Amino acid sequence: SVQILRCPDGMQMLRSGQCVATTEPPFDPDSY
């Protein structure tokens, strides 16, 4: 993993090359 980018656990790499980090919008809570 010797590089400037580096995509450890959580960063999913795509076939194109871009790295999609786990930043997807989860289920909108409801306070209570």
DSSP letter, residue 15: S
Closest CA to 19 of 7, 32, 8, 2: 7
Q: Where are the beta strands (DSSP E) in 1-32?
A: 11-13, 19-21
At 30, which amino acid appears?
Answer: D
Structure tokens at 14: 């795509």
Q: What's the CA gap between 29 and 32, in Å, rounded?
A: 8
What single-letter DSSP state applies at residue 25? -
Check if the beta carbon of residue 12 is closer than 8 Å to that of residue 19: yes
At 28, the amino acid letter reads: D
Compute the distance between CA of residue 3 and CA of residue 22 in angstroms, rounded to an integer.
Answer: 20
Token reading at 12 = 């999913």
Whole-angstrom distance, CA of residue 27 vs CA of residue 21:
17
Give strand pairing partners of 13.
19
Alpha-carbon span 14 to 16, nearest angstrom: 5
